[PDB]
Design a protein around this ligand. Structure first.
Ligand SMILES: [Mg+2]
Ligand SMILES: [Mg+2]
Ligand SMILES: [Mg+2]
Ligand SMILES: [Mg+2]
Ligand SMILES: [Mg+2]
Ligand SMILES: [Mg+2]
Ligand SMILES: [Mg+2]
Ligand SMILES: [Mg+2]
Ligand SMILES: [Mg+2]
Ligand SMILES: [Mg+2]
Ligand SMILES: [Mg+2]
Ligand SMILES: [Mg+2]
Ligand SMILES: [Mg+2]
Lengths: 66, 57, 75, 144, 57, 141, 142, 62, 100, 185
RNA sequence: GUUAAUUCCGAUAACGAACGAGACUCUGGCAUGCUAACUAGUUACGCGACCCCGGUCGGCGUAACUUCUUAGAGGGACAAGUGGCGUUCAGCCACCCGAGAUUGAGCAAUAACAGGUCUGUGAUGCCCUUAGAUGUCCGGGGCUGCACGCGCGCUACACUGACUGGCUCAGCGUGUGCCUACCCUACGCCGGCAGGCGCGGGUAACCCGUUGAACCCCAUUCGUGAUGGGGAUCGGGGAUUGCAAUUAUUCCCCAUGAACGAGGAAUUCCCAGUAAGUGCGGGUCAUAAGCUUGCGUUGAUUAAGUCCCUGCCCUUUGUACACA
């Protein structure tokens, strides 16, 4: 049951929309820049949204985003 | 203390005191707009403050 | 129900059967001795450690419950 | 030692009760009433008996040497507390009862507490639980 | 009761809150006990921020 | 060379009893052949030298940890009292069947009473125990 | 000469084992008593299997005295199981080459992973309304 | 009737009203030409060989 | 000299604040100090029924209260430790003074 | 013996299975070999990861049963190590060849259940599981109320199931179950 | 379609949101990294004792250090990487690295039930009672009473067992009271025991306590017999509690030794340290666990699915129901 919710996905889409330049295709690099630009009060939620950001990275690399 | 109470029982008993004073002043200051207390107990004295809405009554 | 009567000490024929049939048995436990010559398991242990005292059988594993003895070395 | 010897007592009538000789002595003299496994291993202890023997191996006179131990426990250093007939109500002695005296002494006190009209008393005559049980739910086998 | 509840609920929202919630229940002009319930604004109910966001009375 | 801790204890508990049996100065109580050894069980031991066992089998604990008295010894000889129709529980040993052991082993100089309560074990018995254990290790060899 | 020390834990369910390496003989004893008589002898060469996967050739140089505390029987023997192998590879981190360490740690890896990694399986807490953590009391319909 | 051996090519679905029989298409290892769908009771791995008692058994499975 | 200041409360970060304040007040006046020793905390547990009556489903509360125990060791006579101990304590914390 | 391994006192090599179907499901050989079949556990977490567990560990897990034997695994590895010498004294070879022969015999190749019962083939994992489970039962039914102990019970049930003697309590219900399976098809 | 989930994707007169879920909080697991510790230890060293240079020691004392011990700030896991299936979406599965690739709970919306509680209360309406009391106190009994039925449970039906020795391994805790008069106990003697008498320690990581727990384990004794399995009824004796034990308060000693040979119809709980076996704390407690709430020890069989049964929800449909 590892479906991440809209609370993850809204913030992840906003981060990847405003900050497509400073992000990379691996989790640990853009893990600490999303907490740099965005205030995430829970480190578990921080680790969720950066993972979904890294998941949207290769979709943008492969082709057109939503 | 000379009776030398335990420290589990001391932290239970002063919390009982904090409950009983808060409850007694809910009883007493009801029409006076009571809101709360907290009990800053020090050595050599116990500071006890009330906090309420209407004060001169 | 079923009423079996094991021997409590040996008969002369049963001690003869001990002398003639136990060492060539590949499996030597007091349980199989108790079912093959109708004896209590306690002196099936006690009468068969006599056979180790006179050296006709060989221990492999000794236990509070399962003492297991073997044949003689036939070669 | 291994074979059944001559004079192998299959049967015995000690204190006028039966015992098979196919059993060990220490757990065979438990089959008389009034001697269990605890008191048996003391009356065979005060007698010099190698207690690996079954009840058919032992010879003819120590089977009465063991008898006198029970009728005279204070002759043979068996203490006050180890008995079962301790501090009697009428003569106040410490004794040991054996296989025909137990059911007699069970009369000897229960008709006494019957005829004294005690609450302890009437329950035995009724056939009811005595020591304070709850017979509302348990004990339905005896009556109907 | 219904006018007093709005006279409280407008005040404790114009004094600044994300949302409040006021219940009144019991026997009142009759015998059958009814409970009407007054809300507005946001209100969380589960988890740890119940400890320090809402205050019950 | 050898010591007490380097050898199988299951065989060592027979040799420590045998060395006390060969000495035979242990101040045996008269009630050793009739007594029940604790509350948790009912039946007497099968062997006839249980006190000769339990004396030096108590003394070997007094090399591992001293300052341990009759409460520690009625603890370490506790067992599962089966209460019959109710669930079983842990219960102690008899106090006197360890107290006579301690009074015996302070009589014949193997242990002695010590500060912080209990018994410690004397250097004489400390020599004696691994003197036995060297013989046990030679039996192993 | 130099005190070549490494002092390495090992945890089964509750039991914690503290192995401690020095250079020396093949002295491997747990809490001051040697290995081959440790309760029970039912699984004695289970406790000997880190020696038997390695031989005496590497245990010859290092003598290890192992403390153990807590847990049960199987917990203590599985604690001193992995504590001595983790202590061996932790000594072989520093005082021999790591290209001597790898060829013996991957023996343990290819044999059984629990020989050097911990077991986080712990006792799940009992809940109200049950005799156990998952089991519930009997429910009486009608 | 000989005892035949076969290998799974695909695991498809569960049948049984209680959901207990993994219906699976398999092909034989001596005759790898054609393939038949049979019910298998128990855990069925992909990449698995199994003993079939006959090749005349088949049913309809939705 | 060998003065013990043991502090207790059931709020963690409040006593973590005031013990660090006592450490800073010790460092500022050139005193030798041992670190704050974290004693194994008491977790006082009470499990009662939820229901005021007795019929329902058998559900139980699980109330905890964690009281904490930290201590500071200093080496000075008492003209230095008392004023820094007296200043800046916040309401849950309770300190003590032990000469030994 | 650092590289080659002794199965307790036994050969772990030179035992060749005859069943193609349960090759990776059987577990004795070259990495599956273990000194005693007591272990830490973990093999009951995923679905097919219980097949990476040796048969001696599976039997030492399985044949403890009926409440009083729950949580007694060193107590029963004692029993199976006592039974190993009984196998050696009876048939005269490495007991794990006898064990895998008993598995391939006693494991029912096809059964019948509901989709009225229709014949359904079994899984090889469930076949070795049910082989072990039926070998548990005869070792216990004979040892109940008897002087003839489990050290002979799991011995001779295994020995009879090695050749399929139609006497082992596993083998008789093996004879029942696929017979009624081919009946109701 | 997918997920534990109105959890998301995706179709689309809807778009953007809120509550619930999730998020959060506590706990479990790993970090040879930080801060540390005479009430926690470890390694060395100096002694002591014993063994034939070395070994052992919870035998003593002290130069480092925090590995084990305690608990703070931090970190660590996100379906992250690979390979399949899939709108190539949301996601699922396997593998790699890994301490973890589904730890367990707490909290838990809209509402409803004439569910329960006036015997939790100085929360309360109304009624009854109120001096010969339905107030209060004291004495005695009762709440236990037993042809029967039902439910929650405990012990067994044995040999995988029982008995008797010995080996030997825990964690949650708790412990001197406003009233309150009642603690956990070391050790030494008396006694087989329950217990008694002395001195001590502990208001507590200090003392109990290295909490030497069982099951298990090592060796005995019995032999398929209602047997030493089983331990109900009952007889006698001795202690403790209290003001008082009789309807035996509870314990101890001996004896007596019942049914019970694996339980029909039916039915409960459960998938990982899980069930189950096993014992220990806490509550109630002067006396005290076949209960309950927690804790630890040992530790699996089976399965990764479905709507067959039983429930519950949602869509469609009918309604003359709407206190439904
Ligand atoms: Mg929320
Ligand atoms: Mg939640
Ligand atoms: Mg006891
Ligand atoms: Mg009132
Ligand atoms: Mg009154
Ligand atoms: Mg009154
Ligand atoms: Mg009724
Ligand atoms: Mg009933
Ligand atoms: Mg009885
Ligand atoms: Mg009876
Ligand atoms: Mg019977
Ligand atoms: Mg049912
Ligand atoms: Mg119609």
């Amino acid at each position: 049951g590892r479906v991440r919710t809209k609370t993850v996905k809204k913030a992840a889409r906003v981060i990847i929309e405003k900050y497509y330049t400073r992000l990379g295709n691996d989790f640990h690099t853009n893990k600490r820049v999303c907490e740099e630009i965005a205030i995430i009060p829970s480190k578990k939620l921080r680790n969720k949204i950066a993972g979904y950001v890294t998941h949207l990275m290769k979709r943008i690399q492969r082709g057109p985003v939503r | 203390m000379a009776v030398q109470i335990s420290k589990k029982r001391k932290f239970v008993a002063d919390g009982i005191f904090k409950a009983e004073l808060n409850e007694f002043l809910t009883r007493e200051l009801a029409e006076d707009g009571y809101s709360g207390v907290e009990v800053r107990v020090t050595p050599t004295r116990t500071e006890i403050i009330i906090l309420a809405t209407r004060t001169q009554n | 129900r079923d009423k079996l009567n094991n021997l409590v000490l040996f008969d002369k024929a049963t001690y003869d059967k001990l002398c003639k049939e136990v060492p060539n048995y590949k499996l030597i436990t007091p349980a199989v001795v108790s079912e093959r010559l109708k004896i209590r398991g306690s002196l099936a242990r006690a009468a068969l450690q006599e056979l180790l005292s006179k050296g006709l059988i060989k221990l492999v594993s000794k236990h509070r419950a399962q003492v297991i003895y073997t044949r003689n070395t036939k070669g | 030692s291994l074979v059944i010897p001559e004079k192998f007592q299959h049967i015995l009538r000690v204190l006028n009760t039966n015992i098979d000789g196919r059993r060990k002595i220490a757990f065979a003299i438990t089959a008389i009433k009034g001697v269990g496994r605890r008191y048996a291993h003391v009356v065979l202890r005060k007698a010099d008996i190698d207690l690996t023997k079954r009840a058919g191996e032992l010879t003819e006179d120590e089977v009465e040497r063991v008898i006198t131990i029970m009728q005279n426990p204070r002759q043979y250093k068996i203490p006050d507390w180890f008995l079962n007939r301790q501090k009697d109500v009428k003569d106040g002695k410490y004794s040991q009862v054996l296989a025909n005296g137990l059911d007699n002494k069970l009369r000897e006190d229960l008709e006494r507490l019957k005829k004294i009209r005690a609450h302890r008393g009437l329950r035995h005559f009724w056939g009811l639980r005595v020591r304070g049980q709850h017979t509302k739910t348990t004990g339905r086998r005896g009556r109907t | 009761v219904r006018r007093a509840c709005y006279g409280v609920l407008r005040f404790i929202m114009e004094s600044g809150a994300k949302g409040c919630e006021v219940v009144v229940s019991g026997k009142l002009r009759g015998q059958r006990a009814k409970s009407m319930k007054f809300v507005d604004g946001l209100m969380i109910h589960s988890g740890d921020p119940v400890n320090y966001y809402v205050d019950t009375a | 060379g050898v010591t007490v801790k380097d050898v199988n204890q299951q065989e060592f508990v027979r040799a420590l009893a045998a060395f006390l049996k060969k000495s035979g100065k242990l101040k045996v109580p008269e009630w050793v052949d009739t007594v029940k050894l604790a509350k948790h069980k009912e039946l007497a031991p099968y062997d006839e030298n249980w006190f000769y066992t339990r004396a030096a089998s108590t003394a070997r604990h007094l090399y591992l940890r001293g300052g341990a008295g009759v409460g520690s010894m009625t603890k370490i000889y506790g067992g599962r009292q089966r209460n019959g129709v109710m669930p079983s529980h842990f219960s102690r040993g008899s106090k006197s069947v360890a107290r006579r052991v301690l009074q015996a082993l302070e009589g014949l100089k193997m242990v002695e009473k010590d500060q912080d309560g209990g018994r410690k074990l004397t250097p004489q018995g400390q020599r004696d125990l691994d003197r036995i254990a060297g013989q046990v290790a030679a039996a192993k060899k | 000469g130099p005190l070549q020390s490494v002092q390495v834990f090992g945890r089964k369910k509750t039991a914690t084992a503290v192995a401690h390496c020095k250079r020396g003989n093949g002295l491997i004893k747990v809490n001051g008593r040697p290995l081959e008589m440790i309760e029970p002898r039912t699984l004695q060469y289970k406790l000997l299997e880190p020696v038997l996967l390695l031989g005496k050739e590497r245990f010859a140089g290092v003598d290890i005295r192992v403390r153990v505390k807590g847990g049960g029987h199987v917990a203590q023997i599985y604690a001193i199981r992995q504590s001595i192998s983790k202590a061996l590879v932790a000594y072989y981190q520093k005082y021999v080459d790591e290209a001597s360490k790898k060829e013996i740690k991957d023996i343990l890896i290819q044999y059984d992973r629990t020989l050097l990694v911990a077991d986080p399986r712990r006792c799940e807490s009992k809940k109200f309304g049950g005799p156990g953590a998952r089991a519930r009391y009997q429910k009486s319909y009608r | 009737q000989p005892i035949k051996l076969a290998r799974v090519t695909k695991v498809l679905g569960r049948t049984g009203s209680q959901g207990q029989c993994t219906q699976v298409r398999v092909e034989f290892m001596d005759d790898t030409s054609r393939s038949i769908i049979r019910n298998v009771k128990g855990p069925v791995r992909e990449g698995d060989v199994l003993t079939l008692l006959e090749s005349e058994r088949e049913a309809r499975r939705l | 000299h060998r003065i013990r200041i043991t502090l207790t409360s059931r709020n963690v970060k409040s006593l973590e604040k005031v013990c660090a304040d006592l450490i800073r007040g010790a460092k500022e006046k050139n005193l030798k100090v041992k670190g704050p020793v974290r004693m194994p905390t008491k977790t006082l547990r009470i499990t009662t029924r939820k229901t005021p009556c007795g019929e329902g489903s058998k559900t139980w509360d699980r109330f905890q209260m964690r009281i904490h125990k930290r201590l500071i060791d200093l080496h000075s006579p008492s003209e230095i430790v008392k004023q820094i101990t007296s200043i800046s304590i916040e309401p849950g914390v309770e300190v003590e003074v032990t000469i030994a | 013996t650092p590289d080659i391994k002794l199965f307790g006192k036994w050969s772990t090599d030179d035992v060749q299975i005859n069943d193609i179907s349960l090759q990776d499901y059987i577990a004795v050989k070259e990495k599956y070999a273990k000194y005693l079949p007591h272990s830490a556990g973990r093999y009951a977490a995923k679905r097919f990861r219980k097949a990476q567990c040796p048969i001696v560990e599976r039997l030492t897990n399985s044949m403890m049963m009926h409440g009083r034997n729950n949580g007694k695994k060193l107590m029963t590895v004692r029993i199976v190590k006592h039974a190993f010498e009984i196998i050696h004294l009876l048939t005269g070879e490495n007991p794990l060849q006898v064990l895998v022969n008993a598995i391939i015999n006693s494991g029912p190749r096809e059964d019948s259940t509901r989709i009225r019962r229709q014949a359904v083939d079994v899984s090889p994992l469930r076949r070795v599981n049910q082989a072990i489970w039926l070998l548990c039962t005869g070792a216990r039914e004979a040892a109940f109320r008897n002087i003839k102990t489990i050290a002979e019970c799991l011995a001779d049930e295994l020995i009879n199931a090695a050749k399929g003697s139609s006497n082992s309590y596993a083998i008789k219900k093996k004879d029942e179950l696929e017979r009624v399976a081919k009946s109701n098809r």
